[PDB]
Design a protein around this ligand. Structure first.
Ligand SMILES: Cc1ncc(C[n+]2csc(CCOP(=O)(O)OP(=O)(O)O)c2C)c(N)n1
Ligand SMILES: Cc1ncc(C[n+]2csc(CCOP(=O)(O)OP(=O)(O)O)c2C)c(N)n1
Ligand SMILES: [Ca+2]
Ligand SMILES: [Ca+2]
Lengths: 662, 662
């Protein structure tokens, strides 16, 4: 068959699956089918029977609303995605959800839908490939060598995150990142020139990318030659600007915004079939077309050849081969747990009153030699977030390094680290002040939705940062992380809880972990061995009375000290009080019921929560008959000690509130 | 005095004030003093005696950490900011907080600190001047004519929001926006070439800006000539790239990342005075330097001339003069309340089962003719968000219009609208799907912190949107808005509550209002005249029993219908139940104690909350002995009716949970 007929099979499946679901976006899949036919049949290195092959090329559909394009490609090339799933596009529990979801459908590399993040994830996959090749390849033993391809549309180019990630990709010279831009002149509001007039080619040359302009996106020969030129440029990422017609093939709706996001209609589909010359009924693909699209034979040959090369590598470099396999699987080193527990025990025995941001740097220093898979960075706040350790080597200086200077690009940083984690081989950690989790908020949600491991280090967590004032002092950000599904959030009260929280975050395989750290120094608390083990349960009894408590204080982070001092004052007056330290509400909520009742007994309703954060969160644990010493307003610019007094974080106010319940 | 000695006055005050506070950032203020001297003494049109003059030029310091730069300028030119406040920089309740704050210090036009948002607000100020001039100027009476100047640094340039708002500024041809870039080669991590290598001039030419490269930022004549040239380009915004030395004057710290954000030290300050030739003691400015910087005489002369122009304008165009005055004050038209009340009562009398996104478009259509100050827009979702009304005219087609096609730029859209609100003369509304409030989250927080009126229309509020799936279906976003100080959030259950929420939002002068709207149709509830009036109290009794209730349902938005059906089943079994509709928790919490107790009596603890959003928010109203029917996970891709069933939003499940409390 001609290349056009093969590309028309993508068009037929896309328009028919959107029509059957009566929902979805036919436009982009029909406008990009010729580009995808060239990319997938002539260049993409993959094996449909093993979507986990370590050295496969990575493809990312950043304009994720065109999901029928990737489902058509996966079906046609031989992945495990049967025609029956294409007929159940957008239906309950099918393997073809409205936007592609990683882990759910074989062959899908990331979850897209939120514009801009797929090209960010692809920059992260290209950094991972480059860095893993630099760390493991040996001359004649290049076991890491694969490209990262991305499709993106006008919506991704308008979003600010495309500027963050493509600017940094130009700095880091990612020659194996090749992006195809669907330049079709249309967005949801209509013709884009009323709101989008950039000279995009000139903008990308300003980032140091190689750019190929004016590619006829409906001519296979033109597309093929552009891909060949881009693959020969090895020191700059490439942008291929492909001029396409949205909804290509539809006599009445091609080139209009009406083909973007609704079914074409049965009558228009009949006309489109005739204009394309596509003679097959819905969901019918002839044998001859499958034979030209299937990639099972070539896929097995390419992976077979790589397995022979990896076996030769393991005979000369056995230790490196075992590390490569452990890291690609995301397995922890077998001695890690033991060494981390010894370090934690040592800190409990040698108290230090230091900020938890410094305790965090001390844990990175202790774990660094044990976890070569670290790939960490900070958004231009290394000296304040304290993310460098003695072994950090920045990858703009040494390609085989383990640290990234991300620049002032929080959202791009977090979504790039999600691409690092999806690639395999690394354990990324990212960092900025806690307020600026608001710049990166949806990339944090996307790590939790895609169940990816990433440690997020957020320092300067409250009015305790002082003079910078209310634009930087967090109030309500912690509560927003705590109610995000699948997010783990730790607010440690001293250097020991900080080390426990870092251990929990590196061992968490199915989701991210945010550490909420202080700028100011925190006193260490004394613990028995039983209490030291309970820190990982998220909430635990830190101070107790003989007999049952009449009053319970619940505190976190820097406010644990205040609740211990109030406990000391009330116990001296004969009150039976208890202090519960709650570094993580999500780890506590997961404990068995008898554990949670032994910490927070249901019969004790006189409960006081103490935290320099928005008060309304704490009704979950104190109920309507308790009291909350928290913030209800924005902060103020002044020295931290004065702010804690101004906002009621004093021993006298805590005791007074507790006494009102007695 | 030479220009350099006048600029050194800024340098001395800035390093000495940082030194006294022992906190703050001397680098940028020392680097940019010479540019500020030229701009403020030779070009800025302002009156220090009236910082609210409607036709003043607007100045924005986007690199807000250099706050002593603006406090020095306001003090020196004659604003009401005495030397004692400069001596109290960063101290509790001073008029010189660590980052500049609008509303607290005379002359400060916006609150900056979060990088990238200053330049976004400046773009909104320039949009507002252009649109207001087009609406009100008449031949021989140009009552609106002023520039918008912004200073920005490398941090602002790296942030994604600078691409969003500078790209749109180019499309809109904002000739009166002139930005100065502090090109000093340094950020907090060190020399920026490791992480920032853009050809910034070529990027801004790709946006359609006029760019002046390689300006010696320490040479007054070069700076003056570049401003003159930028002022003469009237159809493109200009970027002046000014090469400066960070910490200019300090022998040992100039040009290093050490001068960015820590005091220089007494010894260094002494050497800096010697290098600069600055002889005066700390906080000592000679009378002759004040005489050259004071702008009170010139400012009063220019405002006096504008006042006479406005009086002549009001004689020739009396209707337009009265509207200009009303809009600049932010007052409602005198018949708005009565007309809006009539529209609301009409809706209650003529029920319709429509989505609240459609009820929102219907309110825009009714209020549109009454509020010519609307300046609304959507982030490329006009046909889904339903933000156009019959009188919408986009400003890319007609400069006197009232609608902005923002493109796919949620964060730039929201911080531009903040700049439109700060300028005066308009009431902005912005819109996108609720999930993408996470892309613009810190701009939404800054609207609340600055106390600015903006209506934010967020549609597609829950798993009720259906097939687009978990990347798009909100779960925890409404709870994050509700715990933001000074944010108002409404989730109306039908077309009547929707109109009351829009009315509340346009009348709210001291903060923003978000409307949370459904994609799917909502049934209308019956109300007496008393219930109809209580909708604006945020929480009210919708259905009740005789005597004190034994069980109370609290529901919002699309779930009120489920709660009412559960009430009907339980009432038929003889339970005394009540249903409370709670469209706004923040308006309910502001009610007096007597009203809140009448709606939610403290003695009744059997309370059930029903809402398709994260469950943990609701402990605030249901306590520990109540139940919540909510979401605790991400959503799924499927038709809406099936998701409500799958996640437990059914009458039978709500009845079952309620019965467990009885
Ligand atoms: C961050 C974000 N904002 C808004 C949307 C809603 N949305 C989906 S596609 C789209 C614009 C369509 O533009 P383009 O990328 O040009 O796609 P095309 O119509 O050409 O396929 C928008 C606004 C989204 N998915 N993500
Ligand atoms: C959104 C955001 N992220 C991070 C910061 C913390 N921060 C303050 S200044 C700065 C970088 C300094 O760079 P530049 O703008 O070049 O300032 P200069 O040192 O040249 O004054 C950073 C990262 C911030 N204020 N806002
Ligand atoms: Ca497009
Ligand atoms: Ca700089």
């Amino acid at each position: 068959s001609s290349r056009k007929e093969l590309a028309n099979a993508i068009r037929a499946l896309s328009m028919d699956a959107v029509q059957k679901a009566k929902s979805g976006h036919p436009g982009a899949p029909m406008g990009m089918a010729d580009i995808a036919e060239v990319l997938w049949r002539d260049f993409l290195k993959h094996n449909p029977q093993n979507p986990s092959w370590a050295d496969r090329d990575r493809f990312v559909l950043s304009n994720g609303h065109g999901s029928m394009l990737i489902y058509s490609l996966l079906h046609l090339t031989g992945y495990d995605l049967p025609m029956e799933e294409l007929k159940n596009f957008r239906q309950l529990h099918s393997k073809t959800p409205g936007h592609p979801e990683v882990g759910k459908t074989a062959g899908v590399e990331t979850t897209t839908g939120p514009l801009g993040q797929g090209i960010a994830n692809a920059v992260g996959m290209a950094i991972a490939e480059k860095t893993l090749a630099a760390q493991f390849n040996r001359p004649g033993h290049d076991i890491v060598d694969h490209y990262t391809y991305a499709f993106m549309g006008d919506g991704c180019m308008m979003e600010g995150i495309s500027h963050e990630v493509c600017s940094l990709a130009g700095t880091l010279k990612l020659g194996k990142l090749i992006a195809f831009y669907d330049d079709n002149g249309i967005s949801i509001d209509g013709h884009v020139e009323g709101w989008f007039t950039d000279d995009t080619a000139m903008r990308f040359e300003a980032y140091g990318w190689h750019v190929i302009r004016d590619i006829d996106g409906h001519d296979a020969a033109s597309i093929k030659r552009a891909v060949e030129e881009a693959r020969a440029v090895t020191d700059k990422p490439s942008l291929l600007m492909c001029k396409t017609i949205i909804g290509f093939g539809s006599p009445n709706k091609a080139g209009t915004h009406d083909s973007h996001g609704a079914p074409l209609g049965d009558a228009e589909i009949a006309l489109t079939r005739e204009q394309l010359g596509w003679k097959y009924a819905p969901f019918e693909i002839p044998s001859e077309i499958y034979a030209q699209w299937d990639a099972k034979e070539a896929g097995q040959a390419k992976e077979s050849a790589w397995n022979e090369k990896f076996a030769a590598y393991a005979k000369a470099y056995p230790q490196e081969a075992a590390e490569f396999t452990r890291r690609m699987k995301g397995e922890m080193p077998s001695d890690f747990d033991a060494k981390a527990k010894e370090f934690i025990a040592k800190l409990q025995a040698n108290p230090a009153k230091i900020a938890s941001r410094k305790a965090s740097q001390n844990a990175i220093e202790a774990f660094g030699p044990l976890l070569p898979e670290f790939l960490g960075g900070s958004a231009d706040l290394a000296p304040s977030n304290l993310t460098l350790w003695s072994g950090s080597k920045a990858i703009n200086e040494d390609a085989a390094g383990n640290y990234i200077h991300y620049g002032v690009r929080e959202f791009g940083m977090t979504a790039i680290a999600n691409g690092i984690s999806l690639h395999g081989g690394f354990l990324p950690y990212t960092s900025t002040f806690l307020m600026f989790v608001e710049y990166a908020r949806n990339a944090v949600r996307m790590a939790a939705l895609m169940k990816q491991r990433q440690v997020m280090v957020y320092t300067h967590d409250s009015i305790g940062l002082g003079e910078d004032g209310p634009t930087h002092q967090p109030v309500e950000q912690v509560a927003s992380l705590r109610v995000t599904p699948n997010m783990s959030t730790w607010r440690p009260c001293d250097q020991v809880e900080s080390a426990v929280a870092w251990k929990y975050g590196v061992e968490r395989q199915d989701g991210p972990t945010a550490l909420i750290l202080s700028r100011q120094n925190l006193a260490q608390q004394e613990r028995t061995e039983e209490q030291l083990a309970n820190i990982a349960r998220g909430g635990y009894v830190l101070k107790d009375c003989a007999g049952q408590p009449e009053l319970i204080f619940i505190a976190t982070g820097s406010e644990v000290e205040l609740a211990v001092a109030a406990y000391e004052k009330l116990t001296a007056e004969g009150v039976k009080a208890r202090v519960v330290s709650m570094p993580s509400t999500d780890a506590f909520d997961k404990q068995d019921a008898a554990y949670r009742e032994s910490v927070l007994p249901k019969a004790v309703t006189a409960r006081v929560a103490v935290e320099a954060g928005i008060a309304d969160y704490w009704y979950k644990y104190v109920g309507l008959n308790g009291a909350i010493v928290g913030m209800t307003t924005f902060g103020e610019s002044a020295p931290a000690e004065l702010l804690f007094e101004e906002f009621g974080f004093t021993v006298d106010n805590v005791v007074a509130k507790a006494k009102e319940l007695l």
